[PDB]
């Protein structure tokens, strides 16, 4: 991560062992669930890329998913390389304008990444950019591990309603579909994929019933 | 480790008991897995050699592996001794230019190692150099303990694909082979060491199929 010192200078520090261990446990216990994408961010906020690399280099399992994360990091970088091309010769020995490998911490170091973050001009969040790319590869992995469908989910006659909705809104969160489609799915598909006449008890509500109204109407139905 | 004090001076501090305990547990539970090499680094970043020695002097087991680490530390040093030979007589009582034993902390002390790190000129990372040498001996040990082969791995008819790939990319990480060979192995051997016709379902993809495309194509095949 990064700290500050007298005079306005900044320094590098280590990533807490407690945070590294918590990242690993989140990956193992949740088996790359959707929850893993934000747990990573909170654990890594105020950090730098070198540390983000170590956390992802500690997980010794679910290694296929990590290759999926790697395929993504190489792409986003290529886009940045094209969008932010090598400027050319640089005056004196000034720090190089950041490129695809530098944001990740491969062709660079922590001191250079921290210097870029507070470069007097063009301070660049090298740390935040590499986490966004990483969250994209984690989300692809969360889907590959659990490819269950929102439509596939169906209610059971001796099975309650709250839990069916629970399975429904949890599956929808993982998806990366458009918000309006999510809105239609959460006002139509849920009423549709119920028990034969439980669809009717949900429809008792006049229209576009709010979920407070639907979770109370079918309590013990 | 190292801290700073008013005036720009630097000092030495102890290595956290929590970090020493976590290094030992990483070695015992993972039985010197590949994960051990980077767990060591994160736990020891911002440290000095004397502390790295204590962590490795606490592990009371897997002692043969440690001798392998020692055989390596003595070699890398000899190379440094030759590359950085004794300069000769030193003016007054200035601190000696570092040698093979000094980087390890044997013929030296923490105060001398910290003074070298911020020597006004030629500040030298005595701490980082001794960790790189150590990571080389740990990697030799990770291989000796688990000498399973990437080619030896084979898929089972009632065994899934994701897990076979998991065993494959985990074994490849431990190896120290060239990257292009790793690239060929991850685009050919994996399709080859499958079930009799599972090789074909993977090949359904037009060519050089990306792992996202391969892990989804053979889901429930």
């Amino acid at each position: 991560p990064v700290q500050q010192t007298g005079g306005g200078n900044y320094i590098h520090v280590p990533l807490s062992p407690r945070t590294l261990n918590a990242w690993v446990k989140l990956v193992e216990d949740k088996k790359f669930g959707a929850e893993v994408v934000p747990g990573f961010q909170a654990l890594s906020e105020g950090c730098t890329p070198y540390d983000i690399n170590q956390m992802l280099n500690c997980v010794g399992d679910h290694q296929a998913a990590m290759q999926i994360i790697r395929e993504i990091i190489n792409d986003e970088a290529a886009d940045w390389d094209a969008q932010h091309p090598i400027p050319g010769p640089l005056p004196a020995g000034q720090l190089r304008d950041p490129r695809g490998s530098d944001i990740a911490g491969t062709t660079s170091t922590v001191e250079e990444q921290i210097q870029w973050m507070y470069r007097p001009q063009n301070p660049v969040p090298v740390g935040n950019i590499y986490r966004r790319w990483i969250q994209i590869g984690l989300q692809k992995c969360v889907r590959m591990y659990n490819p269950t469908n929102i439509l596939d989910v169906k209610q059971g006659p001796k099975e309650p309603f709250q839990s069916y909705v629970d399975r429904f809104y949890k599956s929808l969160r993982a998806e990366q579909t458009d918000p309006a489609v999510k809105n239609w799915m959460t006002q139509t598909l849920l009423i549709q994929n119920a028990n034969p006449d439980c669809k009717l008890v949900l429809k008792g509500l006049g229209m576009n019933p709010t979920l407070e109204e639907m979770l109370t109407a079918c309590q013990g139905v | 480790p190292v801290q700073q004090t008013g005036g720009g001076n630097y000092i030495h501090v102890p290595l956290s008991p929590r970090t020493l305990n976590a290094w030992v547990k990483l070695v015992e539970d993972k039985k010197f897995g590949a994960e051990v090499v980077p767990g060591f680094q994160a736990l020891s970043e911002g440290c000095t050699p004397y502390d790295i020695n204590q962590m490795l002097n606490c592990v009371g087991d897997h002692q043969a592996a440690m001798q392998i680490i020692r055989e390596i530390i003595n070699d890398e040093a000899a190379d440094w001794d030759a590359q950085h030979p004794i300069p000769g007589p030193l003016p007054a009582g200035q601190l000696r230019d570092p040698r093979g034993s000094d980087i390890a902390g044997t013929t030296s002390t923490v105060e001398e190692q910290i003074q070298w790190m911020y020597r006004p000129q030629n500040p030298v990372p005595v701490g980082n150099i001794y960790r790189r040498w150590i990571q080389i001996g740990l990697q030799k040990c990770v291989r000796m303990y688990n000498p399973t082969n990437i080619l030896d791995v084979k898929q089972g008819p009632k065994e899934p694909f994701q897990s076979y790939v998991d065993r494959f990319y985990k074994s490849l990480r431990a190896e120290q082979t060239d990257p292009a060979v790793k690239n060929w192995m991850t685009q050919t051997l994996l399709i080859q060491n499958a079930n009799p016709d599972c090789k074909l379902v993977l090949k359904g993809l037009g060519m050089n199929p990306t792992l996202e495309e391969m892990l989804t194509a053979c889901q429930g095949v």
């Binding site: 070198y50 190489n74 062709t107 | 490849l172 690239n183």
Partner: peptide, 12 residues
């Protein structure tokens, strides 16, 4: 290709 297949993340 920033990270080659199987390459530990981070500096080479």
């Amino acid at each position: 290709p920033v990270l080659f297949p199987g390459q530990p993340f981070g500096q080479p």
